[PDB]
Amino acid sequence: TIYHAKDAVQATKPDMRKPRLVVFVVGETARADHVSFNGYERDTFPQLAKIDGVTNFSNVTSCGTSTAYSVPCMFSYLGADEYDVDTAKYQENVLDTLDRLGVSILWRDNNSDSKGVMDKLPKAQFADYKSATNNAICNTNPYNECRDVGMLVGLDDFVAANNGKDMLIMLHQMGNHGPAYFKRYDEKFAKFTPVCEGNELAKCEHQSLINAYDNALLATDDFIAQSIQWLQTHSNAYDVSMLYVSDHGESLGENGVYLHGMPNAFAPKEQRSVPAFFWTDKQTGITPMATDTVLTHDAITPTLLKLFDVTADKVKDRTAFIR
Ligand SMILES: [Au+]
Q1: How is the chain split into domains, by residue range?
Q2: Residues 75, 301 contacting (CB under 8 angstroms)
Q3: Which of 46, 135, 177, 246 has the most CB atoms at less than 10 Å from its CB?
Q4: 161 C-alpha to center of ligand 1: Å?
Q5: How is residue 43 annotated by DSSP?
Q6: Can you tell me which residues bind Zn(2+)?
Q7: Is 248 annotated among the ligand-binding residues?
Q8: What is the Cα–Cα distance from 114 to 259, expressed in whole angstroms?
Q9: CB atoms within 10 A of CB 231
């Protein structure tokens, strides 16, 4: 294991001040330009729009264009220019640091897995929510596909078992994963019709492809809002905050390009322009950066270190999502 922040120190401890509870929704395939807040022609985030204190960041570039490339980069200390996907597994990452310093680290995954991020930590700290042995919310649709909102159930059991510790909870969304966008959301989110239902995209009508994708965003809107609502039930004992960032974007037909994962060298902008949201309880004193700060996946690591009052030399000068 190649270390990167052995000098990390936590300025204050949860037995000397209020313990901190953060949820980090790791998004999937959401495009910045299909977010109402960024100027999209459709109200794709009605529920988030109603919550005090959500900052929308209009200029975020992902590190890569695929789940395997981007997710380790989001948690890496190296930044996008030095980051090596092929050695990421055995670098210290920001969660390794936070767990070393005693932050209780949980990763629930309704997508695939942590793509190497959690491999150094005990397996009990990772849970698979794609299956019904963990996810109680699977029979809400004719595919029995387990829903992201199932990762919220029982989080109060985790909080009880870590009572009075700092806690970072990662929720890795199914989100807008394709090509079967039509499967990603329940009926109550089927707001735009008709929708595409085939695996051969391009063969679909373009408006119907857009509709299915947009419907899936509506379910992600509901998921992020319920995440914040779950956090708000602990706001008095805990300093609660919520960070959402998508791992990459998605091509939706432009110039004949669909899905994602094109190499950075010639990948279109739709594949790297990702939404990011930050909410915090005003009681925590955290100040977000300007809504239009120029931001990339490099800001995630320093954001998480700052949310837990930890400083590290390697990201000392790095812009974060918070001041
Ligand atoms: Au992805």
Answers
A1: 1-323
A2: yes
A3: 246
A4: 31
A5: -
A6: 28, 67, 247-248
A7: yes
A8: 20
A9: 22
- Contact between 228 and 241 under an 8 Å Cβ cutoff? The reply is no
Could you tell me the distance, in angstroms and rounded to a whole number, from the CA of residue 220 to the centre of ligand 1? Answer: 14
- Give the residue before each break in the chain, using a C-to-N cut-off of over 2.5 angstroms; say none if it is continuous: none
Q: Is 239 annotated as a binding-site member? A: no
Residue 247 counted as an annotated binding residue: yes
Query: Do the beta carbons of residue 321 and residue 303 sit within 8 Å?
Result: yes
CA separation for the pair 13, 16 (Å, rounded): 5
Helix (H, G, I), strand (E, B) or coil at 163: coil
**What is d(CA 143, CA 234) in angstroms, rounded to the nearest whole number?**
34
Resolution of this deposited model, Å: 2.3
Dist. CA 252–CA 231, nearest whole Å: 33
Quick one: tokens of 173?
């969304």
Query: CA Rg, the chain, in Å?
Result: 19
Beta pairing class for 251-252 and 258-259: antiparallel
Report yes or no: 68 and 111 within 8 Å, Cβ to Cβ. Answer: no
Approach to solving: X-ray
On whether the CB atoms of residues 63 and 292 are closer than 8 A, the answer is no
3-state secondary structure of 297: helix
What's the 123 CA to ligand 1 centre distance in angstroms? Answer: 22
> Among 196, 10, 170, which residue's Cα sits nearest to residue 95?
170
Strands 20-27 and 258-259, sheet pairing: unpaired
